[PDB]
Amino acid sequence: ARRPARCYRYCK
Amino acid sequence: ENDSIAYFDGHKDSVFAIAQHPLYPNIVATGGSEGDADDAPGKGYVLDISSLNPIFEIDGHTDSINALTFTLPRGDFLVSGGMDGRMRVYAVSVPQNGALAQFKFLAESQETEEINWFAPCPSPDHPNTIALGASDGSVWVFTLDASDPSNPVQIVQSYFLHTGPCTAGAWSPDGLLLATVSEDESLHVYDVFGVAASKSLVTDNGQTVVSLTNVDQRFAVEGGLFSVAVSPTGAVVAVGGAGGQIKIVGLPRLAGTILASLQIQSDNIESLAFSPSAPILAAGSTDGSIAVFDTSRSFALRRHLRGAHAEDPVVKVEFVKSPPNAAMAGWLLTSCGMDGVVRRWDLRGGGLVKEWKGHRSGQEGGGVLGFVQGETGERIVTVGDDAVVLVFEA
């Protein structure tokens, strides 16, 4: 399962 | 430190989505990932918070559950939306003083490949209507009518105006307008039920009352838009984006002029919220700060809460609708962040009320990715990147 786009925004 | 009064650890991986029954705040649904392997599906649960045992289970998603909502006005349906693009619709029954809430799978559809968000329509005229925004930029509006489960889902609108991923959506308070924003920097405010068009208040595309894009230099936020909110009178929409930028745009009452442009913070505005009863707008940023603006004073800066969540992103801010302590109505703001902490703020000044710990921090694989707090704010239920759901009391 994947991670949503917003998580990739949060991460840096 | 762990301030939680209850917890649910059933999720095998990160929890991305949470929704709450509008009549029964104790009924909460959570959704996320069962693992980072391709063969790991998505999974959702329904909890009754009144170690928690789920009262229902949401299966069928082959990818992470990304969005959940109960319908307005009465939570007749529960809808899940996945990164697989599946939308699953369940009927909801809550016994009077019979027993636990019950759920029945009604239908599944796949209008898009990946659902980013849901928002239920607040219009009393159009019950059980919901909107979603997707990775292909599309925005869909559906109405759910339990009679005829050969087709319980009807399509009210399917908008294809954004090109890049549709990152957020917000209804006007009367539920007639739907404002959505995109990574491609565009804002569209749709005339969902045709009212504006009948009053000659729509743009040339016949679909929106406001359409602003990257070609509009006064509006364009380089790097994209990620948040949107509509003021309690429906008079303006706020959009938040890269670089800490916020734009304020006029709406027709039932337009499209930039009323203010804000840039106090330094990184993505990931969450925007108008107070329901105080003349203020709160903005949460990836730089860890919250900024509060005075909506009756050209969005003058009221306060800049630097390090509200240290230097970790502020994921969500939301005002408590009707706290038990009515003096604080409209002034109480709840926030959560990638520092793994939930906080509540008194925004009357020009203010930390409480903080709730328990989640791991982002650097430890945690961070709070969402929460609900009901109308009164007295119970806060969180979903965490650390695969735990927590319950806090106010």
Numbering used by the authors:
A (entry chain Y): 2 to 13
B (entry chain A): 54 to 103, 128 to 331, 367 to 462, 490 to 533
What did the paper state?
In the case of Sqt1, we were able to decipher the mode of L10-N peptide binding by X-ray crystallography. These structural analyses showed that the C-terminal domain of Sqt1, which is preceded by a non-essential N-terminal extension of ∼50 amino acids, folds into an eight-bladed WD-repeat β-propeller. Moreover, the binding mode of the N-terminal residues of Rpl10 (L10-N) by the eight-bladed WD-repeat β-propeller of Sqt1, as revealed by X-ray crystallography, allows establishing a refined model for the final pre-60S maturation events that lead to the stable incorporation of Rpl10 and the release of Nmd3. Taken together, we propose that Sqt1 may protect Rpl10 from aggregation before and/or promote its incorporation into almost mature pre-60S subunits in the cytoplasm. We conclude that the β-propeller domains of Sqt1 and Rrb1, which harbour the essential function of these proteins, recognize the very N-terminal residues of Rpl10 and Rpl3.
Next, we co-crystallized the S. cerevisiae and C. thermophilum complexes between the β-propeller domain of Sqt1 and L10-N, which were co-expressed in E. coli and co-purified via Rpl10(1–20)-(His)6 by Ni-affinity chromatography followed by size-exclusion chromatography. Co-structures could be determined at 1.6 Å (S. cerevisiae) and 1.7 Å (C. thermophilum) resolution by molecular replacement using the respective native Sqt1 structures as search models. The additional electron density contained well-defined side chains and main-chain carbonyls that could be unambiguously assigned to residues 2–15 (Sc) and 2–13 (Ct) of L10-N. In both cases, the L10-N residues are accommodated in the negatively charged top surface of the β-propeller and appear as elongated peptide chains with Ala6 to Gln11/Cys12 forming an α-helical segment. The Sqt1/L10-N-binding interface comprises ∼700 Å2 of surface area and is established by intricate hydrogen bonding networks, salt bridges and two hydrophobic patches. Interestingly, there are subtle differences between the binding surfaces formed by S. cerevisiae and C. thermophilum Sqt1, which mainly affect the recognition of the N-terminal residue Ala2 and the C-terminal part of the L10-N peptide. In the case of ctSqt1, the amino group of Ala2 is triangulated by hydrogen bonds involving the backbone carbonyls of Gly88, Ala90 and Ala93. These residues are part of a thermophile-specific insertion within the surface loop connecting β-strands 1b and 1c, notably forming a narrow, cap-like binding pocket, which would not provide enough space for the accommodation of the N-terminal methionine (Met1). In the case of ctSqt1, however, the presence of Met1 reduced the affinity for the L10-N peptide by about tenfold (Kd of ∼35 and ∼442 nM), but did not abolish the interaction completely. We conclude that Sqt1 forms a remarkably stable interaction with the N-terminal residues of Rpl10, which is, at least as observed for ctSqt1, very sensitive to the presence of the N-terminal methionine.
